[PDB]
Design a protein around this ligand. Structure first.
Ligand SMILES: Cc1cc2nc3c(=O)[nH]c(=O)nc-3n(C[C@H](O)[C@H](O)[C@H](O)COP(=O)(O)OP(=O)(O)OC[C@H]3O[C@@H](n4cnc5c(N)ncnc54)[C@H](O)[C@@H]3O)c2cc1C
Ligand SMILES: Cc1cc2nc3c(=O)[nH]c(=O)nc-3n(C[C@H](O)[C@H](O)[C@H](O)COP(=O)(O)OP(=O)(O)OC[C@H]3O[C@@H](n4cnc5c(N)ncnc54)[C@H](O)[C@@H]3O)c2cc1C
Ligand SMILES: C[C@@H](CC(=O)NCc1ccc2[nH]c(=O)[nH]c2c1)c1ccccc1F
Ligand SMILES: C[C@@H](CC(=O)NCc1ccc2[nH]c(=O)[nH]c2c1)c1ccccc1F
Lengths: 566, 542
């Protein structure tokens, strides 16, 4: 679970995830995932090829130096801090996981990359590096897991200083577990996977489960205001983090006491949370923990349509009895999920006809090209969980909801960690895309989803895309005041002059549409360098200027020079 | 429900609360509260005189300095204002003991020069532009309930001080039943906000003990906590949007998404800012349907320690009801005295308030008493539960009672991790006794605590300290000293500087240790950007 220093040894140098895990055609011409990492790994998906071909109209056969100061260098040796000027170590840490970046990793090259990589192993190391960076006028860009989807890691082209990629992966210990107060103090480089694993050996968990938890780190979560799948029980990162230590050019930031709630002026933890590497390195953090849940239970519910589903989720929110996780997928995602089942279709009956017949006895009177499905996960004490399950199934019944089986439920949940591997699959077959998200008030969700989807159609048609894009959404989180809506956008770029440009423009147009329908700039992805142009409008000129005042104070010479946010 | 401009029409000029409400000796020589405003108004308290006796051993104006070019321009706005002494003196203080003395017995070194009463966001915008133009100081005031010297005019401040009174800026602007939010002007009081919302079937459930007078804007500025925070949250959970007038301009996010990732959260730059940055003029607050049913409860424990463990367990299982409070023996005996085997001197008591749907309430109630039985806890009745919660809003009236019989005191609070709670309570208590004997207090002071909020990582501990000062040379200086010492003992035993009261000017000397030098400095950089000429010059925090 520890990220090794030469990452490409275990991880794909040119896309998401582990080397051992990729989609391939098996000996029977069926898509399948290699390796044994996931429960879907090594499982034939016989209907997946057909769903891809139907959805995108492709056949699926035809395919696609280090400038550094010597005095600094000499001083860095005294430290014993491990470092590297190797091109592959630098290029690996020159990007996150936005589409354009993955393309420059593949057929091309980055304009700017880190000049050198350092691997601090403790808070004190980080202090020395930041001291050295003051002394030699270095730029620093921290990296944890490298999972940013906001251009949060890209080196600005015109940065002339020596860029240090300050890799926190080796700074990864649980320093203490306080069982009395239910907190764990950890180093910021620990990955979510490794954090839960170790805590579990003591009987504990954080329950903070973002989809990137295999590689995303405690310090990255804090930096980007990360959200996890089980936020309803455990909180998002701002509810979970109770203390932190941050190294800035101006000094260390750390509160004295760990009183559970304070009134001592504006809460400085929130100046840092969401700071996106522009202020310093978060080195250690104290995070709330919980007894590992005794029992988990999956479920799923089908509704006549998306609108009915949304209203049910709204009512669940209203009664404040959301489960650990509830997600409502639109019809396309329901069909996609059907397209991963193991039943082998006759080549003479369409996708849609097997679907209709499959759900004819099961979902009566439901239109199969209109229906939507909520997946559900419950956890806690068995007796509590089962009580709560009945409560939730009884509310959903009032919106036309029909219980669709724990199997759909469990399936949706496992699939979450494998979806990110589909980009690479898509890329080999001229299919590009990206996920994006917003949060919106309850009263805007249905119109927002509908208009955002239709904006994507219109803009793809107008730019020359030959087939109507995949354009699907789901509701991933509920709150009192609204919801997180999460979208996928994908298309075949065959015929297109400049496919990245077209993706670019269409993703911007979507964001315009989102905001115009009362949605937020971001729910959890952050701003990075992707959404800077809307920031001022979203937080106000004065709010923007207050962010700048904190930045100019703690980092006056702009050492933490990723240029995210401002 | 609206506070009148001449507040002394309705509220005591020299102390807490309403003119119609004061404790007195009734026709049978029993203490009782005047008026009909509270459920204990007009209810005789036969045993409270005995308690006071056993416990304390007693038997029972400067001119308005203001520029005329400013004043000439104020008249064009039609914003209501006063330079009258009694309007300025009412707004020169909140509710710390030394303030209550200068108010009664003498005078404040400095008071506001003019009181303005804006009615809306645009009025406030004009006030702030006028203050930029004529170089004035603004100290916002809402309910005047600060117990941190957050309202005190600094003595050496020689600019005209405007008391910017928000009480006429007090309507609900809209209630969004789809999103369950309520967008309000920031001067609305808690009582008036809950009254209006209840006509629609809704509540915020935010219930500070000061709710009759304290305001949405005050709450946000002080990071206020309320009695049913377990269900509804504290103010930082409740607020979804705000509009703020600073000298640099208006702070306002441009969308009501429930949760964002758009950098460091700017609401938290203003929440807790204590009137040092601008005026909070409007706020959106989460609302909920009014709960259907409420029930009180109480549990007796063999000692305080068992009590604390039980509440730790209840927190651990995340099954706290609306309110749960644990009282030490001395507060348990105080309650017993105020009605209309197990060791007597050690036995402690938790009061409970459950609310929501009737059948859910009863299941919850069973779960809680079950958890409690494991720590020796015995159900001790609902009447008990109720009396404690009724008392909540009368205790503030006991100050002015006490001051008639040479008894002075104050309450104070901290938050602390679970495993510091028991020792912090014992040590803080003992530290007060020690300080009181060393300073010449005839009788051992009243020194009680209770645990008032529980959380994942710990609890809120609320203390009362009171003593008879008959015979003491400088009894305010002794109290001041003994308060300061109990805060040192709090900080030394793992406690925070403040759970909810805040910092103002009373706890300023400890802030830098608490938040670190770089933290402090971050706050100063925000202040200097937003308010470069320090128009918001109350000098709280920094
Ligand atoms: C497949 C996939 C799934 C995802 N799922 C989710 C999800 O469910 N929820 C969610 O919120 N996000 C998700 N993300 C986005 C991303 O994982 C988060 O933003 C995450 O919090 C970043 O973690 P990281 O450790 O990879 O940070 P990195 O990507 O390494 O860095 C992100 C930012 O923080 C800075 N930074 C990193 N570490 C530190 C530190 N210690 N101190 C200061 N600054 C630092 C960097 O400079 C950069 O600006 C996902 C991304 C991918 C690619
Ligand atoms: C009897 C009693 C009981 C109390 N109970 C509680 C309790 O249960 N929980 C709790 O948290 N606190 C409590 N307090 C403390 C106090 O009531 C709170 O801090 C409250 O939030 C202050 O509200 P207010 O409207 O009275 O503010 P004020 O006392 O008017 O002002 C407090 C500070 O806020 C500033 N301010 C006021 N309004 C604005 C505005 N619109 N914009 C900018 N700044 C502004 C002022 O300058 C001052 O610095 C209590 C106080 C008393 C006397
Ligand atoms: C899964 C997405 C590509 C993508 O957006 N990857 C990054 C990613 C994956 C899963 C996530 N879950 C998130 O909350 N943010 C995420 C970000 C995708 C893959 C192939 C085609 C289209 C497409 F949108
Ligand atoms: C009740 C207090 C006086 C006091 O502290 N009033 C202010 C106050 C009242 C109730 C509160 N509830 C709070 O949470 N903070 C509070 C602050 C008191 C009165 C007489 C003698 C002693 C004494 F401590």
């Amino acid at each position: 679970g520890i990220i090794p220093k030469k990452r490409q040894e275990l991880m794909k140098w040119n896309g998401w995830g582990y080397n051992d895990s990729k989609f391939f055609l098996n000996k029977k011409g069926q898509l399948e995932l290699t390796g044994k990492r996931y429960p879907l790994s090594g499982v034939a998906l016989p209907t997946f090829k057909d769903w891809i071909q139907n959805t995108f109209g492709i056949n699926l056969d035809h395919k696609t130096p280090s400038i550094v100061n010597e005095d600094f260098l000499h001083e860095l040796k005294k430290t014993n801090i491990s470092y590297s000027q190797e091109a592959d170590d630098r290029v690996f840490r020159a990007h996150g996981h936005c589409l354009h970046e993955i393309f420059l990793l593949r057929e091309g090259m980055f304009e700017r990359i880190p000049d050198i990589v350092l691997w601090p192993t403790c808070h004190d190391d980080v202090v020395k590096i930041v001291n050295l960076a003051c002394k030699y006028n270095l730029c620093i860009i921290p990296i944890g897991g490298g999972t940013s989807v906001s251009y949060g890691l890209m080196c600005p082209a015109d940065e002339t200083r020596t860029i240090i990629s300050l890799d926190t992966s080796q700074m990864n210990r649980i320093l203490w577990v306080d069982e009395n107060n239910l907190t764990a103090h950890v180093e910021a480089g620990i990955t979510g996977q490794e954090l839960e694993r170790q805590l579990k050996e003591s009987g504990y968990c954080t329950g903070h489960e973002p989809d990137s938890l295999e590689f995303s780190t405690v310090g990255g979560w804090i930096s980007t205001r990360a959200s996890g799948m089980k936020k309803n029980i455990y909180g998002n990162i701002e509810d979970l983090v109770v203390h932190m230590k941050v190294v800035t050019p101006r000094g260390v930031i750390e509160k004295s006491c760990q009183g559970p709630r304070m009134s001592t002026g504006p809460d400085i933890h929130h100046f840092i949370m969401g700071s996106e590497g522009t202020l310093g390195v978060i080195t250690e953090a104290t995070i709330k923990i919980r007894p590992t849940p005794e029992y988990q239970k999956y479920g799923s519910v089908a509704f006549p349509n998306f609108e009915q589903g949304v209203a049910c989720l709204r009512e669940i929110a209203k009664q404040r009895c959301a489960p650990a996780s509830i997600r409502l997928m639109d019809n396309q995602q329901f069909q996609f999920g059907h397209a991963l089942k193991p039943q082998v279709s006759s080549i003479f009956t369409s996708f849609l006809d097997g679907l209709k017949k499959f759900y004819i006895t099961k979902f009566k009177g439901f239109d199969p090209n209109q229906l939507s499905v909520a997946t559900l996960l419950f956890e806690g004490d068995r007796e509590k969980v089962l009580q709560h399950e009945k409560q939730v199934y009884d509310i959903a019944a009032k919106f036309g909801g029909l219980a669709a089986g724990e199997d759909n439920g469990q399936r949706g949940y496992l699939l979450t960690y494998v979806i990110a591997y589909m980009r690479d699959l898509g890329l080999e077959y001229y299919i590009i895309g990206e996920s994006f998200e917003t949060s919106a008030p309850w009263d805007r969700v249905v119109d927002l989803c509908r208009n955002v989807k239709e904006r994507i159609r219109r803009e793809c048609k107008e730019k020359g895309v030959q087939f109507p894009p995949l354009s699907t959404c789901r509701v991933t989180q509920t709150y009192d005041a609204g919801a997180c809506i999460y979208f996928y956008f994908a298309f075949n770029y065959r015929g297109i002059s400049d496919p990245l440009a077209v993706f670019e423009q269409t993703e911007a147009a979507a964001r315009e549409e989102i905001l115009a329908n009362g949605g937020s700039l971001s729910h959890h992805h952050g701003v990075g360098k992707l959404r800077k142009q809307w920031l001022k409008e979203s937080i106000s000129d004065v709010g923007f200027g207050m962010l700048k005042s904190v930045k100019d104070y703690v980092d006056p010479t702009n050492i933490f020079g990723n240029r995210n946010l401002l």
